């Protein structure tokens, strides 16, 4: 199979970076709705690197308001592992989440590979906050910040991230979908200069233009790999309700399959992060399938699938 | 009243061009909902044709897969010469569905009167699967590929298809709202070179731009009559529920609104099909009325109703 | 604090400009969700004026088909006085209805102050109809036709209303939203050639180039105050359903916040209203929740809440 179609399943089911049980059955719901299957049908190259065995760590001490650091840290260094692995065996790795803190893993793993990667990161939220300017404690709304050059000396010393080392600049990344950001993270959005598409862009310019602007932003130069980080409540709660943090006035389901659609047509996919599906905070058992199949639709998208339709290289009138 | 008011209605109470029953009583709860009327109030000069009785044909035996070949092409034939009688009375032709496998007969028809016709086909599919290509069999899903110049030769001597000549060339036919396109209807779409706007477009540039690039494509190098196909499925679930064959992402209450006041404004629409009502499989009788009223507001909106609003040529402030 | 962010609450507990009861609950509602607080979180100086005593006004028997006469001019005549003391005090005038026929009162206060004023009309509704053109005889769909200067001798002597004297001409007014105009109402639109956008306008150009054309057609020659009449109904019903006069394909959650946004980075709002929030025609308890949480997200995106995020101008990192 093409380039953009060879694949390596990474399962990371793992919640600890958020209080909200449940996320952590997201690459088990993924993969009960036939995704792997569907991707298959899709002439994709599969290769499936399991789920990835997240051990308890009794007396996991949270470093001041920052909870669970050692599970959170250790999880991500095992994916980083995980990645860099499947990278190493030309494949594009596709990881099944999860909480979003597991992108410090995914990202990092990648670059150890792909070091000119560029980052486009599509979520409600940055997730830029650092342990010192977060509210929540959460680490699902801190990856950014491990991952950034210019937050180096703004990062403390926190247990179980001592392995992490800083991979990406503020020129590297760039957010599509933004609702809910802090104002820690805003003022680090300003500061640091860092490329986004918030809801209001998104509204002025229209999905055309901003594929079309962060495409040029990232590749304008030359062709490098593409890194997507698709957080499902990117996305509107009436099309991902099972979700952790939803924001109403989302990106719709057609936005949504309109950036994996450009992305996918680049043929530069690299990397690819499927995460906080949580299905056991949908409201009735529709809400949940209705994430799942929506999660599942972003990912057959990233992978080929064509709204305009899909055809196999064969004479179908003969 | 004006050319693009004077209004031909045609009944089309027929289901067997595909196997889920009830799309059949399609006219009946369009003409329960006061469509003539609410035309009438909108200054159309009104002038009901009836329904069509389509008479049931015993021991149709499938050709191949192709189920009910001489049920569909009777229908057809019978519409073929109603929509032609309509055409020829200076009247713009309104068909009432029913199943799209209609859209044979109604082209037919129109074409016998007005050859230089342009096709405007609001669909979440393309239904130009040939009676060879098709893995369902279904008639509803095949009616461009009978219509199309090009196609020729590769359509085989299905039973009661026979009267079937070939009306449009590939060039005069533009796809709006295209989501689900099988492989072979995606060969032939691209193989061909038809103009077309799926769901990636429509992001992409927005309804406004799609509608000012159909109608210079269609329009452009001279006036020319204008065949509006419209499958209620076109439409997102969320407004148009009770159809055979939903597909998630569609087009808006407010685009398809968009795209037939547009088609309006131009004072070439000249052949009309509502189609793909099936008031048998809504949910809830809310989700069958809310199917009927989009489909209403649609037809409205095709023969003068504006969202910015419509007065009568008399002084309102005297 | 801010210009942008003085605010000075008007509670407006009336409901006589139209037959629905509980639009009068509008102020009681919107204060019980914590618009005060939240707008206080928002670095905003909030004075809260109170309710307005709406003195009941009985034997008030109609002029011709309009109802209400003398509740309605007294109540917009209260208004007023309200409106012009705020401004006075140099605080940006929060209207808290009520059904829009307040606007008659809150635009005639605003311009006594600032009589250079500029109106941004967000209402699905264009509410020009006189008390001649009127089929309904209700005040809430009549207030713009009492404050334009171009229909002067056109107004009758409705009782209640002597004291209003045309404050805006018809150059000074943009309409966003329209898809409910009545045929007496379209004339004058068409006839005075008042600038308008609706749901056709918003969907041909987007919501950006729709606010661009907006601000640059009341703000190019000249910067002046802003007066934003907001009424919920120009949002559409899956997020603002607990409304007398619902009008399905409405503007969306983000295509309201994209145009109080807009006005916001202006920093020239003046005046606002936020009308016909009604508690009582709530389906459901949840449609009256969401109603009231809309109305408030749209209030709180005019005095400064920002998709992208907000800041205080402090060090973050230190
Ligand atoms: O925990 C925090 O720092 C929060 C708190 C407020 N709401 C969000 C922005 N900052 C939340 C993060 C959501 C993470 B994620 O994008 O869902 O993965
Ligand atoms: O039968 C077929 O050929 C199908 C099978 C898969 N889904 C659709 C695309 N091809 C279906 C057609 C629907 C017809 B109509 O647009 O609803 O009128
Ligand atoms: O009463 C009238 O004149 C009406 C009658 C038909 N529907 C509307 C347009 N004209 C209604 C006004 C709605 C007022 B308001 O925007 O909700 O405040
Ligand atoms: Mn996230
Ligand atoms: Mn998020
Ligand atoms: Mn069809
Ligand atoms: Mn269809
Ligand atoms: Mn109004
Ligand atoms: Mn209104």
New interface residues.
Partial sequence: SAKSRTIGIIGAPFSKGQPRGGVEEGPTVLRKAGLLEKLKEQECDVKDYGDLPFADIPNDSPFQIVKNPRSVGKASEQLAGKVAEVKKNGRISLVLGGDHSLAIGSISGHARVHPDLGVIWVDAH?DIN?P??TTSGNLHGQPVSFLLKELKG?IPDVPGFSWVTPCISAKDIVYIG??D??????????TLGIK?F???????????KV?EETLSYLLGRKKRPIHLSFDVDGLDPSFTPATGTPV??GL????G??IT?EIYKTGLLSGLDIMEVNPSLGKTPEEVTRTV?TAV?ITLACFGL???????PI???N
């Fill in positions: 940055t650092t010192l300017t703004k933004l609702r950001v802090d104002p820690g993270e805003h003022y680090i959005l300003k986004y918030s809801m209001t862009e998104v509204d002025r310019l229209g999905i055309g594929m109403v006035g719709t389901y057609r936005e399959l309109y659609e199949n639709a064509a709204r305009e339709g899909n055809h196999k004479d179908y009138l």
